[PDB]
Design a protein around this nucleic acid. Structure first.
Ligand SMILES: [Zn+2]
Ligand SMILES: [Zn+2]
Ligand SMILES: [Zn+2]
Ligand SMILES: [Zn+2]
Lengths: 167, 49, 196, 262, 143, 783, 115, 66, 171
RNA sequence: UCGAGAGGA
């Protein structure tokens, strides 16, 4: 593997090295192996990293894949797009799924949840365990068809008195 | 009008596990058309003889 | 469409005058674009344009056929002897000014076919009409005067755009809409309808 | 006395010639006018009494418009819209009749020999279908067998080809200039040889070859416009070209006339 | 007023995938140290190796003015028919605009021109303060 | 799902879309009916009455009209019938259901709209013939080919719902995709295929044709230029005449491939003050690219200025092209006679290469690669030779073909064409494979009965030696017919799969928005970010800038950045500065030139920790490698004359600016610390650009020019800050839905990293989003 | 249907003169003239003719849209000299040039016989 | 469906031409290329017009009238 | 067809000879020697299973004796009639499908169901819910042998119209 | 209306 690294002169130069790739996932014990860098050593599966290292090192490895998945066909997306979703799955505590189970069981609003996949399932668990709705969720304002706190209705306009008398 | 006559619909379930079926099998030589098939939905499931 | 899968649609019509002409005074029955063939990789089309011209000029119905030992070089030889350029290209003049066109248009009678999809039976526009019997929203189908379904992802766009008030009115009077009276204590459809 | 002309050969339906001291634009504008802006006559409203023929009432109605009619005295006839009559008349319309019955058990063929003008001629060579068949029955209509009937009343009205191609008395204009391509307006596509691959034109004979060696003409201008004009029969091949010049300066006479008005 | 006076000898005629135009390299007589890259059409004007062609640059033409914050004269007027004469005596002739003033070696300089699409490079010295800026300048060729 | 989140709507229309060059970028060709079948309400205001009463008396049929007239009460006067349908009293404060008119903001939807785009505000232009006209260049955000493709709608009703389209959703607003921080639309088809042939040196447009090309620009001043020559005929350079469409006050620089500041191959691009200097126009030059003119045009000039350019280029280019012409034939895809012998000898070495290796596999003397089995290892060797052949056999005809070949020209510009498209059509198709593996033996040990048992030869294993030009053989046919079907089989599922993903993302996203404290939260108040995308910037304002500091040898950084007043060889020539000698040998002023260098060198080492890959080019706000180039064009700075300012002015000026580049105002330390943490990189770039030495050595800045730059960079950065209310998270959902829609429709060839190559695109993306403990790709990199 | 009528292409509408003279405010001594019910047929041979004059500083025609048969025509001439007369002269000269071909060919056809 | 009156590309009358063409290949017994050379069918658009045409009308006629 | 190893005057050749052709042609001329007469043992019906154990000769010319144009065991049991016979209905109507890309032809093997033309002759008498006909239909200029059997030269789908691969404005 | 099938891109 070729690697651009700084020459003692100051300049960054192509300094190749030997990297050994596998077809197995065990880090907990391969890290403990001497004669290998236990810093540069990245496993394909981010799910191990999150459990081995920690959630912030987990979000870090989550982007790497998310990025390369888009970077594959030579497609580019501005960091903040992928660094939002990646952070989204971690900002809960552990790892969050982007399917029925992971996010549709979250702290989120009852009417904002029954929108995605599980419809009558989320409507029964909400009414029986008695829960409130923020009426801040997009789907909620959409259902109600009222001035949503989105761009245009985020803030709230009121009448001014100073420039009313003035003109 | 002819193309609706020399046609073959297939069902689903029971079998069709870690198999094709859609993908043009070698055995479809001469018997079935290699290009006549309806895109998306039942593509490669409904063949024309 | 040609017998290849080149689903063409008209996007303007010109008559004889405006249309370009060969030295013999031949105007094309229609004009395609050079951009179809590389993305589709439709080669059999280019020979169908070709082989049909020889088949028309010789009189003898030229055999297109699938697996037949016939080559374009074999076709070109019979076309060269027919007086016309063997490669198919013909020197054309701009129907507007008369001034010769730098590039020579490929001219050949490709067998085209009309499709059962016409705009006059595709078109629709609804500005308030018959609403759904149960849901009180516009009906479906152009025929029964049915409004265009502003899909789930269309909503997702008015959200992203930051159009909190577009979709606020779009979900209401601009489509469905409704006025009700409810209890402050219970918050349900329970107030008895009288008003007057 | 300025722009010169020389007829190569002239037939009953075609005229081949050459044009000298002429602008290229005016040369191309000449064909444009000859194609569409040439005033002719043809059917516009086909009235039906009875039809039993295997052709749709509108299939026939279309066919007719395409059948050529003598338009030698076109100008005398007035445009229907320009006329003062409550729709149609003799001064703007030429009524026709196509009565037919499949008496002959055979494939009863119908031609121009079957349609009769039922309006006043006004002593003018106009409204006569063009027959060009050896047996004397030009342009085939339809066919009938036994009890099949067709009785019509097709009505001819003025109009130019800019309204419908049926009033197009230019069958196709053969247009060419600079066959040796000294002016170099076209880039010849070639894989081996330019001259060998590209067909040499009939018009090469009537022009000076480039002789080679001498650099391309810097002060280049287009001339020697070779043309063959084909009529359908509606109007004689000589009138076709002359009326093309007549209407063109007319379409220009209108502009200055209006300029003065404003 | 003039801004150049020199003669150059044809060194190379290079089409380079092209047809109507040719890349040209030449050397000056007045100074051997001085060189040129000339881009030039052929169809009308043919070129042959080792030829004496009286080259010139200059700005706006005439004797009077000499002109007061145009700058053109404004837009453009056709060559009339035979009225008004500038430096018509010269053969080929072009119009373009400069862009780069490359610092070669001590006294040596390279000035880049753009004749719409065509380009021009030249070397040596003696040009200095009177050569360019304003960047807009013509081109003249004789015999 | 079908009544609340998406429901049937009133004031909507659908009909087939059509391309048009004579239509504007922000325009819609609403059919002469439709805008007659749809109604916008207007209040009887004194600024419309005469137009309105005329339209009411124009009724619901004579094109611009009105169907209903609403009174002071709940009465709706229907003019389609009515008795006073022609009269109409027309009183103030009354409503009118008026027929849509030209330049009337309206929502345009191409189903399925995934991203923010595909849902623009096209100003109406009512035209005849039953089809929905639309601009050619606006086929990039919708991704719609005009092949009987039909489009949806929604006409706004209130003036406020309309203001939302007009001011937030207008088509030039969406000209730059925050997705890839680069443009959404660019020049395509004929307008791309033509412009290449127009912008070159071999092209000369004669005066007659030229005069009209100038009139075709509706923004053309009336200033006739001077022909690029004189000679016996006055000719014009295609670029020179195109430079007309390019607005004067814009400078572009590229330098690609060759590029020698005088390239003979017309490589790269140079445009100065809306004028073409040198180069050829390609997909890279005009079309949607991270600097490809349009990106510069919008950012530097304006969105309306750019929207106007889009139309200008189209009409002009297309005009020359209708008169120059274009075509393609069988000949355009014909390989030369000697090339035909040489293209066949390419397979001669290949059919030998395979055999020599096959004979090794049969005689048990095969080495058999690591991890792979003997069978696996062999197939991988035989697959390499087949590609090696066709991928070079493709270059064998490509390089051989002349430039006058329009097929090469179609690919040379871009528009519609790639290297593989010529290759298969002209040279050879290659080996067709299903599930990566070649054509397996369906019948026992044989692929077809027309072949013998155990025929591992490429001919019998699925290789297509022939070209499409040569035609195919029954075997070659059925083999490509097998591998061709598989393409469709998967691509249909690939397109159905990307669907469930898009929703999953956007749903889990919704509520996510920038709140009024740069805090990216949601419905709850659960903080996703404290600063949006770690900088609090709107993604459209960001551009790929090279940080000068990080690069070069430590010697070159000192040679370009170290300013030592006390030195003789490491000081400034007083020809650069005004007070050059009066400031020389100074000790109290050198304090800052050391302190500047402390903060300037500090960056290089910190940055090297950040971009460990040693990469300088990064997407960042405010294009400074331009604001400085802008001064040299505007102020016409010398060249000969010294700088009108001193060192005390630079070092402090640059410092005092950083203070003003605010994002978060909050008094407390943490928030001010976060603001420093947010600007960090921008300052690293700013300091790399505004180094006290650089400003004078190459830049040449006066007081007027420098103080302007400081004020420009400040407003441009404060302009660059994110807009609180931005649905940021419903966004960055489809700003990932859209890239995922394509991609996988091309993915195939190359093993070894077989796991990662197969578990790419959508297959591995189900694994990612769903987050499931299933191998597919367990493979760990060992450093 | 939605499509227009075929006669609309040559016929003149409700209050639309075959010519509309307006002055181009962008350039001095310049004019813009719209040709309702008219196409290339005229504009092209008008472009070619106006170019031939020496007093003509500018001449260019533009087919607005192929939908509607109206082309704009911009003419700019020498200071003091009116552009309408530049059009008036050329318009007449074209008829003089045309009338010449009408007769040259007329006699040339009598001379030619026959097939 | 009866010989299509006038060619679509050029515009030359093709009504009378059927009876002649249909016999020419029978009364004289020769190829199409010779018949289309005669009849004055110069350009190919006019030439195809007849050759590529199918006279179904003939088959519709043998259906008893009503 | 059935191929056999014996040839006293040659080497190997299929059981069908130049005498059987004139024998079949006589039946076609008059309207006795049929496909049922090929009971003779000159042709065989090869099952989906029976195909597993067989060897078919592609072109009988290319695959028979000892020893520019497109790219070109000897224990043959049977022989192929024509590789055109591998395609279905609508696929036969496609000219040079071999010269074309495979999915392109798959998209075309659907357009045939959208085509206009004449589907029958009776239609005038035959009352129907939705029917489309062509004013002047035309048989193709380019013919693929199989069309003669599919009656496409008798009941077409479109017309042969002059196609100009042009860049005549941007429409 | 409701539930099944054929196509549209
Ligand atoms: Zn209550
Ligand atoms: Zn009640
Ligand atoms: Zn009267
Ligand atoms: Zn014709």
């Amino acid at each position: 593997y070729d690697r651009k690294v700084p020459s003692p002169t100051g300049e960054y130069v192509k300094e190749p090295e030997w990297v050994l790739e596998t077809d197995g996932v065990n880090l907990s014990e391969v890290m403990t192996v001497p004669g290998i860098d236990p810093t540069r050593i990245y496993t394909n599966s981010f799910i191990d990293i999150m459990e081995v290292l920690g959630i912030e090192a987990g979000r870090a490895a989550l982007y790497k894949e998310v990025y390369n998945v888009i970077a594959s066909d030579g497609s580019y997306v501005n960091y903040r797009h992928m660094a939002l979703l990646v952070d989204v799955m971690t900002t809960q505590g552990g790892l969050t799924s982007v399917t029925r189970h992971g996010f549709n069981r979250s702290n989120t609003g009852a009417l904002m949840r029954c929108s995605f996949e599980e419809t009558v399932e989320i409507l029964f668990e909400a009414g029986a365990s008695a829960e409130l709705d923020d009426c801040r969720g997009v789907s909620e304002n959409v259902i109600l068809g009222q001035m949503a706190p989105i761009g245009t209705g985020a803030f709230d306009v009121m009448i001014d008195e100073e420039s009313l008398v003035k003109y | 009008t002819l193309s609706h006559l020399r046609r073959t619909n297939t069902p689903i379930g029971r079998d069709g596990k870690l198999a094709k079926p859609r993908q043009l099998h070698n055995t479809h030589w001469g018997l079935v058309c290699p290009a006549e098939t309806p895109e998306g939905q039942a593509c490669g499931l409904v063949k024309n003889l | 469409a040609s017998r290849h899968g080149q689903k063409g649609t008209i996007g303007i019509t010109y008559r004889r005058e405006d249309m370009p002409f060969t030295a013999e005074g031949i105007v094309p029955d229609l004009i395609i674009n050079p951009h179809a063939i590389p993305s589709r990789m439709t080669v059999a089309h280019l020979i169908e344009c070709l082989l049909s011209k020889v088949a028309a000029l010789s009189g003898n119905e030229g055999d297109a056929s699938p697996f037949t030992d016939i080559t374009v070089e074999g076709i070109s030889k019979l076309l060269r002897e027919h007086g016309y350029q063997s490669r198919g290209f013909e020197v054309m003049y701009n129907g507007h000014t008369g001034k010769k066109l730098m590039a020579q248009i490929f001219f050949g009678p490709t067998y085209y076919q009309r499709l059962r999809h016409m705009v006059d039976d595709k078109i629709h526009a609804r500005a308030r009409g018959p609403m759904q019997v149960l849901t009180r929203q516009p009906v479906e189908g152009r025929s029964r005067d049915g409004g265009l379904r502003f899909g789930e992802m269309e909503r997702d766009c008015m959200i992203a755009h930051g159009a909190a008030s577009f979709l606020k009115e779009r979900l209401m009077e601009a489509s469905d809409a409704f006025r009700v009276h409810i209890c402050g204590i219970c918050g349900l459809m329970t107030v008895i309808a009288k008003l007057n | 006395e300025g722009p010169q002309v020389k007829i190569r050969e002239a037939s009953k339906d075609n005229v081949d010639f050459i044009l000298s001291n002429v602008d290229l634009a005016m040369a191309n504008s000449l064909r444009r006018v000859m194609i569409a802006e040439i005033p002719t006559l043809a059917i516009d409203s086909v009235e039906v009494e009875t039809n039993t023929t295997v052709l749709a009432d509108e299939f026939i109605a279309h066919r007719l418009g395409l059948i050529p009619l003598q338009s030698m005295d076109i100008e005398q006839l007035e445009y229907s819209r320009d006329c003062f009559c409550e729709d149609h008349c003799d001064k703007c319309s030429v009524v026709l009749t196509l009565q037919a019955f499949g008496e002959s058990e055979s494939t009863t063929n119908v031609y121009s020999k079957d349609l009769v003008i039922v309006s006043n001629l006004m002593g003018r060579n106009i409204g006569h279908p063009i027959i060009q068949d050896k047996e004397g029955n030009g342009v085939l209509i339809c066919k009938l067998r036994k009890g099949q009937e067709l009785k019509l009343t097709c009505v001819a009205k003025k109009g130019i080809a800019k309204e419908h191609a049926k009033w197009g008395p230019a069958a196709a204009i053969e247009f060419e200039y600079d066959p040796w391509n000294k002016l170099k307006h076209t880039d010849y596509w070639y894989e081996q040889d330019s001259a060998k691959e590209w067909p040499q034109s009939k018009n090469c004979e009537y022009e000076d070859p480039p002789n080679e060696g001498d650099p391309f003409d810097y002060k280049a201008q287009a001339d020697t416009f070779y043309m063959n004009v084909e009529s359908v029969g509606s109007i004689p091949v000589d009138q076709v070209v002359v009326r093309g010049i007549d209407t063109l300066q007319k379409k220009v006479a209108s502009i200055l006339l209006a300029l003065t008005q404003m | 007023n003039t801004l150049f006076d020199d003669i150059f000898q044809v060194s190379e005629v290079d089409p380079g995938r092209y047809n109507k135009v040719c890349r040209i390299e030449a050397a000056s007589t007045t100074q051997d140290q001085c060189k040129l890259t000339l881009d030039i059409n052929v169809e009308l004007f043919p070129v042959a190796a080792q030829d004496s062609l009286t080259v010139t640059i200059a700005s706006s033409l005439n004797l009077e003015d000499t002109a007061n914050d145009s700058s053109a004269t404004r837009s453009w007027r056709p060559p009339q028919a035979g009225d008004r004469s500038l430096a018509d005596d010269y053969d080929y002739v072009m119009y373009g605009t400069a862009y780069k003033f490359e610092e070669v070696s001590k006294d040596l300089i390279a000035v880049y021109y753009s004749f719409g699409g065509l380009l021009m490079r030249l070397e040596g010295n003696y040009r200095n303060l009177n050569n360019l800026k304003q960047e807009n300048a013509y081109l003249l060729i004789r015999r | 799902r079908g009544n609340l989140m998406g429901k049937r709507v009133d004031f909507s229309a659908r009909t087939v879309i059509s391309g048009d060059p004579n239509l504007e970028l922000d325009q819609v060709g609403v059919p002469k009916s439709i805008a007659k079948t749809l109604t916008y309400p207007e209040v009887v205001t004194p600024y419309n009455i005469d137009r309105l009463t005329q339209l009411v008396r124009n009724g619901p049929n004579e094109h611009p009209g009105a169907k209903y007239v609403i009174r002071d009460s709940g009465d709706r006067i229907d003019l389609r019938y009515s008795k006073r349908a022609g009269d109409i009293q027309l009183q103030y404060g009354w409503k009118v259901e008026r027929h849509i008119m030209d330049n009337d903001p309206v929502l345009f939807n191409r189903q399925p709209s995934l991203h923010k785009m595909s849902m623009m505000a096209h100003r109406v232009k009512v035209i005849p013939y039953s089809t929905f006209r639309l601009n050619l260049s606006v086929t990039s955000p919708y991704n719609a080919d005009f092949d009987g493709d039909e489009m949806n709608l929604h006409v706004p009703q209130s003036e406020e719902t309309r203001a939302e389209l007009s001011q937030l959703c207008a088509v030039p607003l969406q000209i730059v995709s925050p997705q890839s921080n680069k443009p959404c639309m660019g020049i395509v088809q004929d307008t791309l295929c033509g412009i290449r042939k127009l912008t070159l040196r071999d092209t000369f447009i004669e005066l007659d044709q030229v005069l009209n090309m100038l009139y075709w620009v509706p923004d053309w001043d009336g200033v006739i230029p001077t022909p690029a020559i004189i000679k016996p005929k006055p000719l014009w350079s295609g670029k020179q005449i195109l430079s007309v469409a390019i607005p004067n006050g814009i400078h572009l620089q590229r330098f690609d491939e060759g590029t020698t500041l005088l390239s003979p191959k017309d490589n790269g691009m140079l445009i100065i003050d809306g004028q073409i200097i040198f180069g050829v126009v390609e997909k890279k030059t005009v079309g949607s690219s991270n600097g490809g003119l349009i990106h510069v045009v919008t950012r530097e000039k304006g969105p309306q200025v750019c929207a106007k350019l889009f139309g200008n280029i189209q009409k002009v280019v297309n005009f020359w092209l209708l008169h120059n012409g274009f075509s393609t034939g069988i000949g355009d895809t014909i390989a030369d006679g000697p090339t035909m012998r040489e293209i066949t000898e390419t397979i001669a070495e290949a059919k030998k290469k395979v055999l020599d290796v096959t004979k090794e596999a049969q005689a048990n003397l095969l080495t058999a690669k690591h991890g792979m089995t003997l069978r696996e290892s062999f197939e991988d060797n035989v697959v390499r030779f087949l590609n090696e052949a066709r991928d070079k056999a493709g270059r064998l005809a490509e390089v051989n073909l002349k430039d006058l070949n329009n097929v090469k020209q179609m690919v040379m510009a871009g528009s519609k064409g790639s290297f593989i498209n010529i290759a298969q059509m002209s040279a050879c198709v290659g080996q067709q494979s299903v599930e990566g593996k070649r054509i397996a033996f369906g019948f026992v040990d044989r692929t077809l009965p027309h072949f013998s048992k155990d025929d591992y030869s490429p001919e019998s294993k699925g290789f297509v030696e022939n070209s499409y030009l040569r035609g195919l053989t029954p075997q070659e046919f059925f083999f490509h017919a097998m591998g061709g079907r598989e393409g469709l089989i998967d691509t249909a599922v690939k397109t159905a799969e990307t669907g469930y993903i898009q929703r999953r993302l956007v749903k889990a996203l919704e509520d996510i928005m920038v709140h009024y404290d740069n805090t990216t939260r949601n419905s709850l108040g659960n903080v996703i970010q404290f600063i949006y995308g770690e900088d609090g910037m709107d993604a459209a304002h960001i551009e790929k800038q090279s940080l000068d500091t990080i690069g070069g040898s430590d010697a070159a950084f000192e040679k370009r950045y170290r300013v030592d007043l006390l030195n003789t060889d490491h000081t400034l020539d007083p020809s650069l500065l005004e007070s050059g000698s009066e400031i020389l040998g100074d000790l109290k002023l050198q304090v800052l030139l050391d302190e500047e260098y402390k903060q300037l060198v500090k960056d290089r080492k910190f940055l090297r920790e950040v971009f460990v890959d040693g990469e300088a080019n990064w997407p960042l706000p405010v294009n400074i490698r331009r604001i400085i180039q802008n001064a040299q064009q505007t102020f016409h700075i010398d060249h000969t004359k010294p700088s009108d300012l001193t060192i005390k002015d630079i070092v402090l000026g640059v410092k005092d600016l950083q203070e003003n580049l605010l994002v978060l105002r909050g008094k407390n330390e943490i928030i001010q610390n976060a603001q420093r943490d947010a600007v960090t990189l921008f300052c690293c770039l700013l300091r790399s650009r505004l180094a006290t030495r650089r400003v004078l050595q190459e830049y040449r800045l006066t007081k007027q020019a420098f103080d302007w730059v400081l004020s420009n960079i400040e407003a441009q950065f404060l302009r660059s800050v994110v807009h609180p209310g931005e649905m940021v998270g419903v966004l960055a959902a489809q700003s990932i839905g859209e890239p995922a829609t394509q991609m996988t429709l091309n993915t195939f060839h190359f093993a070894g990293v077989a796991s990662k190559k197969v578990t790419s695109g959508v297959p591995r993306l189900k694994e990612i989003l769903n987050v499931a403990k299933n191998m597919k790709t367990p493979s760990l990199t060992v450093y | 249907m939605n499509a227009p009528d075929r006669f609309e292409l040559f016929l003149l509408g409700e209050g639309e003169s075959k010519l509309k003279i307006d002055p181009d405010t962008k350039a001095p001594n310049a004019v813009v003239i719209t040709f309702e019910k008219e196409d290339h047929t005229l504009g092209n041979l008008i472009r070619a003719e106006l170019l031939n004059d020496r007093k003509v500083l500018f001449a260019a025609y533009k087919v607005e849209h192929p939908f509607f048969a109206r082309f704009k025509l911009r003419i700019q001439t020498t200071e003091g000299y009116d552009p309408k007369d530049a059009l008036k002269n050329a318009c007449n000269s074209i008829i003089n040039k045309l009338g010449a071909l009408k007769t040259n060919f007329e006699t040339e056809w009598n001379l030619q016989t026959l097939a | 469906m009866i010989v299509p009156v006038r060619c679509f590309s050029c515009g030359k009358v093709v009504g009378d031409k059927w009876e002649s063409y249909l016999n020419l290949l029978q009364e004289d017994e020769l190829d199409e290329g010779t018949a289309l050379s005669r009849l004055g069918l110069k350009r190919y658009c006019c030439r195809r017009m007849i050759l590529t045409h199918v006279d179904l009308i003939e088959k519709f006629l043998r259906y008893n009238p009503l | 067809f059935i191929v056999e190893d014996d040839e006293s005057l040659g080497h190997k050749e299929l059981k069908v000879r130049k005498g059987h052709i004139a024998k079949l042609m006589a039946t076609e001329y008059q309207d006795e020697y049929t496909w049922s007469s090929l009971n003779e043992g000159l042709v065989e019906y090869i099952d989906a299973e029976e195909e597993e154990s067989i060897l078919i000769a592609m072109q009988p010319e290319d695959l028979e004796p000892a020893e520019a144009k497109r790219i070109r065991a000897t224990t043959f049991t049977h022989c192929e009639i024509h590789p055109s016979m591998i395609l279905g209905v609508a696929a036969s109507i496609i000219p040079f499908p071999d010269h074309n890309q495979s999915p392109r032809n798959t998209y075309q093997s659907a357009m045939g169901k959208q085509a206009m033309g004449v589907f029958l002759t009776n239609y005038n008498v035959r009352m129907d819910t939705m029917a489309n006909i062509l004013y002047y239909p035309q048989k193709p200029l380019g013919t693929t042998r199989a069309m003669e059997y599919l009656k496409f030269r008798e009941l077409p789908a479109g017309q042969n119209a002059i196609v100009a691969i042009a860049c005549y404005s941007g429409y």
